[PDB]
Each structure stands twice: as C-alpha cells, then as structure tokens.
Ligand binder design. Structure first.
Ligand SMILES: CC(C)(CO)[C@H]1Cc2[nH]c(=O)c3ccccc3c2CO1
Ligand SMILES: [Zn+2]
Lengths: 46, 162
C-alpha cells in the first residue's frame, strides 16, 4: 500500500487500553534500518 | 555486506537497549496466547547491525522525507519481530515484510512495546510457536527481535479500538 496522501507513515494509537503504546506503519522499506539484533528468552513469572 | 558486532553487557549502549526492552513489556489482551506469559526477558545477546549499503539506503530516504516534511525526519527507535529477521539484517526491509492484513494498512509495522513485537517473532498470532516445542510461550528456545531506526516523517494519526 501507500501512506495517506501527504503522509510518510501511519501512527496507530490504542484508545481503549491505556497502557498499550503506539504502533507505526511505513510503506517504504528504505524508511527503516535494523540497528540492533536482540537475542533473548521470555521468563516464566515466579 | 552485513557485519554483526557484539555489545558488552558492561557497555552503556547494551544497558540502554536492554532497558528499552524490559521497560516496554506490557500485558496483552490475548492473555499471552500469541507471545507467551511473561513480565520480563532474559537478554542473551545484543548485536549492532552494520551494513554500509543498507545504511546509505536509509539515510538517502531519510533526507528525502525530512525535506518533504520541512526539515523534520521524525526519527524513532522502535521494535520489530519477524520470522524474516535474518533476511532483514542482510537485505534490508522491503515489500516482503509488509503485513497485508494489518489494520492500519498494508505496510511494515513497528511497535513501542517490545512485548507487542514479541507476538510476531514466530509469525502472525505467534504462528505455531517455537520450532522445537511448538510452544508460543516457550521459556527454553532463544528468540530474536530487532530494535530499528525508523523515519516517520509526517505521520497520520489513526486511533484504534485496541
Ligand atoms: C511477519 C509479518 C511481516 C507479517 O507477515 C509481521 C511482522 C510484525 N512485527 C512487529 O513487530 C509488529 C508489531 C506491531 C504490529 C504488527 C507487527 C508485525 C506484523 O507483520
Ligand atoms: Zn521451544
């Protein structure tokens, strides 16, 4: 797809869950650079 | 042309990235279905991704967007989880990494919550979970996320019912 006319991206902002942070969408691969590669495990709650 | 450089845990840069990761875990409304049940991560490794060609591709576009947006690139650091991570660090982001069914349009998606991106490490909806155990909440297998520099430029604000 393409971004809205006159726009370079979309900001998707949760309006119901007040603890949920934003998500963002770009429509050109060149607008992102993969700066860090993070290797991890999720931890089981104690 | 990609080189991966290990950051030391004693490095402030390593510590800053881990803090971004840990501090942006939240609870999800699927109760952990897609990404698993957890409040924090065990960070095993953080590597800087170095590719001169991919960087110049990025900064060239950043300059275009910046000038189109009146000298404001609106650049962020954001998370991205994907089964395609290893293709991304070598070849860069492209249409193959678009989310066709995304509720904000068919583009490439990034998140401020590390735990939101964790939901996509094994694919949409967490796919079938880790390869080895088929467990979306696996505590054994190693996962990878990208922490990315993203140019937003003029961004359209879409509120969502989430
Ligand atoms: C693997 C694909 C490309 C789908 O084929 C996936 C990657 C992805 N990664 C995120 O971190 C994210 C974060 C928030 C919202 C959506 C996403 C998506 C949606 O697209
Ligand atoms: Zn596993």
């Amino acid at each position: 797809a393409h971004s809205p006319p006159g726009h370079h991206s979309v900001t998707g902002r949760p309006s119901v869950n007040g603890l949920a942070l934003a998500e963002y969408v770009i429509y050109r691969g060149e607008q992102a650079y993969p700066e860090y590669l993070i290797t991890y495990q999720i931890m089981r709650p104690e | 042309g990609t080189i991966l450089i290990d950051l030391s845990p004693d490095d402030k840069e390593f510590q800053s990235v881990e803090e971004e990761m840990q501090s942006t875990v939240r609870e999800h409304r699927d109760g952990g279905h897609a990404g698993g049940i957890f409040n924090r991560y065990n960070i095993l490794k953080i590597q800087k991704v170095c590719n001169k060609k991919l960087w110049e591709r990025y900064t060239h576009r950043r300059k275009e967007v910046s000038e189109e947006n009146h000298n404001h690139a609106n650049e962020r650091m954001l998370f991205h989880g994907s089964p395609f991570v290893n293709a991304i660090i070598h070849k860069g982001f492209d249409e193959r990494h678009a989310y066709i069914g995304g509720m904000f349009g068919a583009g490439i998606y990034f998140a401020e919550n590390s735990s939101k991106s964790n939901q996509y490490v094994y694919g949409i909806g967490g796919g079938t979970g880790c390869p080895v155990h088929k467990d979306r909440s696996c505590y054994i297998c190693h996962r990878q996320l990208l922490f990315c520099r993203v140019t937003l430029g003029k961004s359209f604000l879409q509120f969502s019912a989430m």
